A paper describes a structure:
The human [name] 55S ribosome (mitoribosome) consists of a 28S small ribosomal subunit (mtSSU), formed by a 12S rRNA and 29 [name] ribosomal proteins (MRPs), and the 39S large ribosomal subunit (mtLSU), formed by a [name] and 50 MRPs. It is specialized to synthesize 13 hydrophobic polypeptides, which are essential for oxidative phosphorylation (OXPHOS), thus playing an essential role in maintaining the [name] function. In this work, we use tagged assembly factors MALSU1 and GTPBP10 as baits for affinity purification to isolate late assembly intermediates of the 39S LSU mitoribosome. After processing, we obtained nine well-defined classes that represent five different folding states of the [name] with some additional variation regarding AF or tRNA association.
During the late maturation, we observed four different sub-states of the state 3, state 3A–3D. They all show the same immature conformation of the [name] as the previously reported 39S mitoribosome intermediate. The folding state of the [name] in state 3B, 3C, and 3D is the same as state 3A, yet, a major difference is the presence of a tRNA in the E-site (E-tRNA) and/or the MALSU1 complex. In detail, state 3A contained both the MALSU1 complex and the E-site tRNA, whereas state 3B and 3C contained either the MALSU1 complex or tRNA. However, only states 3A and 3B, but not 3C and 3D showed the MALSU1 complex. Surprisingly, we also found premature incorporation of a tRNA into the E-site in states 3A and 3C. In any case, this finding contradicts the commonly accepted principle that, in general, premature binding of translation factors or components is prevented during ribosome assembly. Thus, the further matured conformation of the central protuberance may be checked and stabilized by binding of the E site tRNA.
Numbering used by the authors:
A (entry chain k): 13 to 56, 61 to 96
B (entry chain I): 30 to 66, 77 to 196
C (entry chain r): 35 to 41, 47 to 134, 146 to 196
D (entry chain l): 114 to 136
E (entry chain J): 18 to 157
F (entry chain K): 61 to 178
G (entry chain N): 47 to 251
H (entry chain o): 24 to 51
Write the structure that this text describes.
RNA sequence: CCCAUAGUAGGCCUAAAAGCAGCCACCAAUUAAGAAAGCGUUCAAGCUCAACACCUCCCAAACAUAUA
């Protein structure tokens, strides 16, 4: 992973899964170990974009999904 | 053998029959019973004083920082008299319904962190939150009017 | 329920949420089994009742989603264990000896090479002890150990 | 007040410390 | 990494309180002592001084200093060199309220020590609570 | 169909059969699964042999017992039959043989929450 | 002195008379030292037995090892070893009188409190070494507080009140129902079936 | 070792009921 | 599952023993982290807990379902 770009819209109906995704893994605790990743989060059904450096483009519409499944998905895509 | 032995002595069979007949029988009901049907006030008047104090409230997701980063942001926002506060939402949702904040009800869930003030310096928090590539600006409300980030930027400029 | 549709794009799509029949004979219960007067009146034989409380991959549903009682959720979990080994759930695979009333796992029981004397005999466990208090239509009770 | 409940929390922490002597 | 010490400004090289404790990350101790010495000239000499040194992975020195300590400051304010032993009932210094208030004005100023309480009652309450655990009696 | 036997549970790995060839070291204990893989006639044969009375008529009663492991019966035996005994255990038909009417007759008990992955 | 005082191997005055092993000093409920007095915690005896000097020394060492003398005090309830137990010479035949006195022993009936704790001490911090020393005891014992003693006594009364069995041990024993005092002891008219030899049945009504 | 079955318990129960009859009729 | 700043490397004696070698108080900060409940170092630094923010060769054969 080299870039992640996540947007969420709490002015509309909110989704807590992406907010916990921001809180527990899209922080400086993981970036203290994974330095090459570059985070950006913006706020206005949410969207998670993962730009891998080599050849992969990962797009997520995390509206109805929970946090555990999407974290396992990102872990599987990191392991590849 | 003696009446008192080191091991449990075997009984006469009629004694065992008496012991087995006179066993304890617990009462069994017809239906199972298991299948049948100051700190909070401190939070109350403290956060109520906060509602009657400010004319806007601001909130973010400030748990993506280390403890020294909390000290640095606390000092950078201590240069002005903005108060940063953390309190649970299980009591803040009643705080929202008591303060007639209907449009602020789907706003305060999860980890939330209040940024209350009486006059705006919000461009300073803007470029603090732009010099780090995370930690967004959760929407607020000035005098019973909701503000998103576009409203935050419009009020900032 | 919802499904995780993946193709790279991944989304969560809500499809086909079921519901119960609108007429429970015994309302104001705690678990839905108590709600339908089935407290002690089911076995491993009925697999519709067992299949309403399992994943499509054969797994067990948790507590708060089902809303079952402690004893009754343990009864459902053990009956699902007993019915999977009896070949009563062939459509819940991820992708030969015939049995019924199986408590333990096939690959976890050592054979009784030396059964004891008549006063200390090792006997084979048959059927779960969680199903003791079911309704009995015989007068000899359930012999749980053979 | 705030100090009263902080003091009560401190005795709770002390009670948890004294019950955890053997564990 | 983060390293915090209580090394006094009277002596630059005591020895074992700075030799083996700094010999794990890898340091050049002469730069440390010249920085500690210029900090010693920047303040009143003959006093312990806490440090805020953070050993960077690029092997550079960043020493940050604030006020003096809290033990020796209160002991020298009461004219005490070696403190009390029991510190529950024994007393050696009798410090009035006004001296505590006067020394509390120049205390809540620093950033590295995080004594940044905006009212006056908080800092004075903290230091009276600290002096209660020592052999200093609060007069009036 | 003495190959499609069903013990009631862990008997399939707990019920052992012990024999002894009279030579020393000839004591053989073999579980029910291994003896069923050896000869799928022997489990029912041993059960009937233990059920019969222990006298000199027993081995003549065993000669009037014809056990076959599959559906195949020889024509001399098959033309001889009179009555089929009812099976003592009611086979629990599984989920596939259930008709749609039998599925629809059983009511569902519970609403799932509207958002769950399964 | 908030510690266990030293327990001697024998009293200072000896006992020159050999005493018979009257084993009925184990059997039955205790009547001495059954209720708490100015203490809070104890090791209740759920069964009778002999305490030797090795048991006394092991209890004292185990209690005084994990010990807080500034917060807890402990008092003996079982006295010094006074009963003389005699053993004959090893590999020698019968007769020739009763053997010489070997060691001194205390007898303890069921329901007896052995030691008392007291002070500013709570339940969970003392169950640790009390359960250890009670598992090291010869008979069945249990770390029992003031609250737990009354709790299990209320449990015993609700078990003897709530039972649906019309036939209890006291009724059959006292009324001589089946002529069955022929196989009962005369002590069963006061033990009421809760005691069999040196043992005690807590779960039995 | 010898154990207690249900027949022994029920026989004991029946004898005890007969004795309860005898106890009642000897009291008047 | 979390999550751990600061008066302070609490004083006394101890080369220093900092909550963790020992005595005594065990106050106090935001809104909350105990002058400290276990590893751990000569000592440190690091690690977990409460609390904050989401909450000689086994030995009858067998059999759990039909109204005692
Ligand atoms: Zn129920």
């Amino acid at each position: 992973v080299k870039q992640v770009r996540v947007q969420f819209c709490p002015f509309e109906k909110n989704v807590e899964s992406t907010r916990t995704f921001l809180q527990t893994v899209s922080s400086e605790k993981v970036r203290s170990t994974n330095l090459n990743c570059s985070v950006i989060a913006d706020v206005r059904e949410p969207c998670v974009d993962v730009l891998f450096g080599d050849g992969h483009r990962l797009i997520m519409r995390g509206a109805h999904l929970t946090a555990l499944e999407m974290l396992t998905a990102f872990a599987s895509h990191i392991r590849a | 053998s003696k009446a008192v032995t080191r091991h449990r002595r075997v009984m006469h069979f009629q004694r065992q029959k008496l012991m087995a007949v006179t066993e304890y029988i617990p009462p069994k009901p017809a239906i199972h019973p298991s299948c049948l049907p100051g700190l909070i006030r401190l939070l109350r008047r403290e956060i109520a004083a906060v509602f009657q104090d400010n004319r806007m409230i601001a909130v973010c997701q400030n748990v993506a920082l280390s403890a020294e980063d909390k000290l640095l942001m606390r000092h950078q926002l201590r240069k002005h008299k903005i108060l940063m506060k953390v309190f649970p939402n299980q009591v803040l949702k009643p705080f929202l319904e008591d303060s007639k904040y209907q449009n602020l009800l789907p706003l305060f869930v999860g980890h939330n962190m209040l940024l209350v003030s009486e006059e705006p310096k919000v461009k300073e928090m803007v470029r603090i939150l732009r010099t780090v590539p995370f930690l967004p600006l959760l929407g607020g409300c000035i005098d019973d009017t909701i503000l998103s980030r576009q409203g935050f930027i419009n009020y900032s400029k | 329920f919802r499904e995780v549709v993946e193709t790279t794009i991944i989304e969560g799509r809500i499809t086909a949420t079921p519901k119960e029949s609108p007429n429970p004979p015994n309302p104001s219960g705690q678990c839905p089994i108590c709600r339908w007067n089935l407290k002690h009146k089911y076995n491993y034989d009925d697999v519709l009742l067992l299949s309403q409380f399992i994943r499509p991959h054969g797994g067990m549903l948790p507590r708060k989603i089902t809303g079952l009682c402690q004893e009754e959720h343990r009864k459902i979990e053990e009956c699902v264990k007993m019915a999977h080994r009896a070949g009563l759930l062939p459509n819940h695979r991820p992708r030969q000896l015939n049995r019924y009333l199986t408590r333990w796992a096939p690959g976890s029981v050592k054979p009784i090479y030396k059964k004891g004397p008549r006063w200390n005999r090792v006997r084979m466990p048959v059927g779960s002890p969680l199903l003791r208090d079911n309704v009995c239509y015989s007068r000899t009770p359930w012999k749980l150990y053979h | 007040s705030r100090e009263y409940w902080r003091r009560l929390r401190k005795q709770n922490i002390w009670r948890h410390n004294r019950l955890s002597k053997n564990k | 990494g983060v390293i915090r010490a209580i090394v006094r400004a009277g002596l630059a090289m005591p020895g074992p309180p700075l030799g083996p404790v700094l010999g794990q990350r890898g340091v050049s101790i002469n730069q440390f002592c010249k920085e500690f010495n210029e900090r010693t000239k920047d303040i009143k000499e003959g006093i312990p001084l806490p440090t805020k040194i953070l050993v960077k992975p690029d092997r550079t020195f960043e020493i940050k200093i604030g006020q003096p300590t809290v033990s020796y400051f209160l002991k020298a304010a009461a004219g005490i060199e070696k403190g009390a032993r029991q510190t529950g009932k024994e007393v050696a210094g009798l410090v009035t309220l006004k001296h505590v208030y006067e020394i509390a004005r120049i205390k809540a100023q620093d950033e590295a020590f995080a004594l940044q309480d905006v009212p006056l009652s908080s800092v004075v309450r903290s230091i009276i609570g600290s002096a209660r655990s020592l052999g200093i009696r609060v007069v009036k | 169909n003495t190959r499609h036997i069903a013990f009631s549970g862990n008997k399939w790995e707990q019920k052992v059969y012990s024999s002894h060839t009279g030579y020393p070291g000839g004591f053989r204990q073999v579980t029910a699964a291994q003896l069923h893989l050896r000869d799928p006639v022997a489990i029912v044969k041993l059960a009937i042999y233990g059920m019969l009375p222990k006298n000199l008529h027993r081995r003549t009663m065993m000669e009037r017992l014809h056990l076959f492991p599959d559906e195949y019966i020889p024509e001399d035996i098959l033309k001889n039959l009179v009555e089929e005994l009812p099976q003592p255990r009611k086979i629990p038909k599984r989920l596939d043989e259930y008709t749609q009417e039998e599925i629809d007759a059983f009511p569902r008990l519970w609403t799932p929450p509207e958002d769950y992955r399964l | 002195k908030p510690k266990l005082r030293f327990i001697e191997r024998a009293p200072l005055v000896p006992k020159v008379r050999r005493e018979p092993k009257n084993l009925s000093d184990i059997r039955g409920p205790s009547t001495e030292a059954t209720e708490f007095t100015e203490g809070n915690f104890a090791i209740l005896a759920l069964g009778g037995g002999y305490l030797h000097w090795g048991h006394f020394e092991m209890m004292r060492l185990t209690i005084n090892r994990s010990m807080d003398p500034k917060n807890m005090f402990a008092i003996w309830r079982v006295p010094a070893p006074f009963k003389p137990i005699t053993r004959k010479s090893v590999g020698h035949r019968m007769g020739g009188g009763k053997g010489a006195i070997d060691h001194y022993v205390t007898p303890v009936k069921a329901g007896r409190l052995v030691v008392e704790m007291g002070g500013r001490c709570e339940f969970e911090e003392v169950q640790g070494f009390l359960d250890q020393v009670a598992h090291k005891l010869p008979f069945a014992a249990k770390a029992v507080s003031r609250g737990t003693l009354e709790k299990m006594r209320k449990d015993q009364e609700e078990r003897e009140r709530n039972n649906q069995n019309p036939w209890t041990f006291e009724r059959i024993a006292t009324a001589n129902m089946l002529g069955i005092r022929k196989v009962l002891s005369p002590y069963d008219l006061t033990h009421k079936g809760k005691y069999w030899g040196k043992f005690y049945m807590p779960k039995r009504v | 070792p010898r154990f207690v079955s249900l027949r022994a318990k029920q026989n004991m129960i029946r004898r005890l009921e007969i004795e309860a009859e005898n106890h009642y009729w000897l009291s008047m």
